[model samples]
Target: GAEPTLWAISDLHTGHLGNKPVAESLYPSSPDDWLIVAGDVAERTDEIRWSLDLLRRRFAKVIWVPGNHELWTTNRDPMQIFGRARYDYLVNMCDEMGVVTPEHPFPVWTERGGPATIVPMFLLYDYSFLPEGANSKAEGVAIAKERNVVATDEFLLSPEPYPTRDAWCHERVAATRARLEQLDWMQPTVLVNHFPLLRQPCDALFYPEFSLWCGTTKTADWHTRYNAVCSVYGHLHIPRTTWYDGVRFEEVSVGYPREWRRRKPYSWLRQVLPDPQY
Candidate 1:
């Protein structure tokens, strides 16, 4: 019955290590509109509350989702320095702010604000930290070379990789599909997630079968598999509006790692490289 305007943002990897200035410049907005944030609000500091304060002042309503960066609960061991107390701390702030956090992977409906639904999908894959379930203790011995990205392969190849973080990805797809199939609405539906459901770089690296939609892995591929209308995601620290066969995939703008890059890399990569192909 009513048509409304919607605005979305994501991947603001703030806190101790990202660029707050870049995040400041990219808050595209209108006074009386809705702002949906995908995830990865801050890194490892209690500053998320401060960031939320700033956001609350700017947007009419704020939605928060935890990103891989937001909750890096991997470094639980004293020897590790990656994980910190910032993750749960931020969630507490969200509770106080009354901002909605998505757990079931289903969309949240608006009563009368307009004619759109806001769904925040939380995909904190990085939370597991370990690739698999067993032998994590033995693998911890390699802490000396933790900085070596090469070691990540062991973790990725672990047994728990899919079992842990991927719990909601498939389950959510089913839930969303069930919800979409049953809903007989004509209003435009929007989907949001902390991880890029349709534009993950790893998809091309691991599974190259679906190259047309960029390297969207199985997790991200669900959107294509299930056929979502408008899905917005974060975690890539880039802004994009990608379309695969008329289905739109939007990556929210993020202001992370202040020195992430002086310019945009997606511009060049998207043209030359074969990203996730849906």
Candidate 2:
């Protein structure tokens, strides 16, 4: 049997995410080996295409599963969002480079004939909550209908412990369990989601904020059910990790406004926070 070595990254947020140097340097190694950018390759298809063009040649293998941001930018149209056109684009890119992107359901799962089959999960059940509307100002009134989570009264002022995406959280756990059961791979797995899995079954790094981590019991129970070796996740703006059971949990987000690193915990108290009212 052939053993496979895998490199994984989540939530690049591409143009909006991280510093170019950090992005280039952060991956444990150069594209000299197999690499999997788990998800959030880009919000814009044009940018996604651009990212592939630049990064594909440098790395041996590249696979991207779409995240909420990708679907959000595309107006949550699952047709175009999860359709074969997107799949073909990725396949062609990999084929041209003599690489492989093992395909699964929309929330993708992958495997290699190895000691441990590597799985890259997309995990975008939250997209349904994104109302049918334009995602940006240029789109005008239509855009206002989709519910801008960052700007809304619901997100900004709601006393609701889980905010607005609670139901979607359940969908993720259910789907994850289905995938886990279907996989031929053994008990412990290497899992990755656009959102965090409950605890550190594999590696525990990010900690403190649990609700921001994976929502309520419905989602957290999934982690508890299927203890994993290590799972890397994104969505939270801050970088942190924690452990539950034995699995390693990592949360990563490359949120808007580049050069975010210059600000600090020390400066944050003084630096004006974004006025919730505004």
Candidate 3:
């Protein structure tokens, strides 16, 4: 039997010259390799689909979760969809393109010598991890702006009828929690999301104010609760392995073109299966 490798990556801004070739060069060492694309492949629907389609053709499996960039939409966008609607559209498209998404039943892989459920999730931020003195989401945003640390989400992403992004986040949490509760406790899990499930990863961000948009405090203890062996995420673009509450959270982001130049030449896809046996 072929040894299947489970790999993960996030924040592939492929439109940049620095990233385009790197993306095009990615290929599996074996026919049974699998991939987890945490998100931010491209903003345009077709471009994202194109990128995933190419990868799907090479890897035995590909799983995806959306990032803030994927959710961004302008009035001029061809689809012009925003917020929940945009996410829904992307999920449906991923299905047609053979890229597994959180909307689908979690895919479990057993080739790694143990049952590991590949749980892809989409839980947006609610700004519940605010710094001291920021009593409200409005206040947090104000502080971020004052520090010149605001993310493009303030202008690009839109959530309708929910009043705010955090409201939309709550809806996602309820839905995701219900789904996660249905999983079997006996099986180990690989939890994947675009944002860090714990606040500890975001705490290291250069501009701590950006932490508000990084993730929600509601998901802080999810790693232990879900029986996850490892939590995979990417949004901060700082790739490293972080341990929190006995769970390993790996940040595997390629980030922007310039960002990659400063770091050593790296493969965005990292093997997490087969336990290395070192």
Candidate 4:
């Protein structure tokens, strides 16, 4: 019998015209294969659910983590009218569809009979990656604005009542750390998240100011500390593999359709870890 493969992709952004069809085309080579959607499937709650629902039926398992786009909201959004919590709402929706989210227990996979767990994490970013002396989020944003490089997060997303996005990041770090700490370190783990877990990958970004929203300085040691065989993340939209501290960090993103279209014959599905049998 052939071993099942683990596949990953992110930033589907299905809200873009014609992207939904491309997403619809995603299919597994075998019935036993699994898929990881590292987020940004769409902005609307229904679209996100709908996209997952379709993919769920195609793959044996689907793991999801929220992206900034998934957390976007406006005063006019219908769900906002009811005071819905964006992150919690998406978790509940994923739960109902049998799609795995960071809030739930992680699913484990074994190759060559060695335990390797799939850890779907939702560790949002803080502005801690900004250059020295850019001590605060305000200062980071000011630097970006001066470079005319403001990220859409300044206008589209809100993690309110928490003072700032970094404040929310601190809370998530505490909770996620507690969970990771409980895992058995003896087993190999595949860590998945929407934001890059380390700053090395963000260093390659065109504008260094954008690194502020790319990841957190606190999570810099998580990859090695958690016994991760590899870490999967997607946000920069520039898909590439990077090595850090003897582990591979893979950026698996489909990005905007225009971006993908430019890369003709783009090989979308990225198989992170090879079958242990090799």
Each candidate's clash count: 17, 18, 0, 0
Candidate 1 lDDT tens digits, 144-227: 245332323134212233453335344545555565555436554565776655433334334222122121243545454444
Task: Give the clashing pairs for model 3.
Answer: none
Model 2: runs farther than 4 Å from truth?
A: 1-5, 17-32, 74-102, 105-114, 125-176, 184-187, 199-218, 257-259, 263-278
* Candidate 2 C-alpha lDDT tens digits along 1-278: 33333455556666654544435544323333455555566655666666655666665555555455554425433334333345445556545655444344322223331233345664433322222243422342234333332322222222123334434445445665676777554545556566554422212323322222232334455554554555656655555455566555654444444535645422111100111121
* Tens-digit lDDT track of model 3 for 1-278: 56788888889877566787777887887898889999888887777887888889999899999988889885555788878889999999989988899998899888874888989998889988787669988898898888898888989988875788999999999999998899998788999999998888777887788888988988878899989888889988998877788777888888998887887855667667766442
Off by over 4 Å in 3: none
Pitting candidate 1 against candidate 3, the one with the higher TM-score is: 3
Worst 10 residues of 2 by lDDT: 267-276
The C-alpha local distance difference test score for the whole of candidate 3 amounts to: 0.85
Q: Which candidate model has the greater lDDT, 1 or 3?
A: 3
Ranking by TM-score: 3, 4, 1, 2
Per-model TM-score, in order, reads 0.59, 0.56, 0.95, 0.92
Candidate 4 clash pair list: none
Tell me the lDDT of candidate 1. Answer: 0.49
Write one digit per residue (lDDT tens) for candidate 4, span 24-79: 88988788888999978888787888899999999999999988888887554557
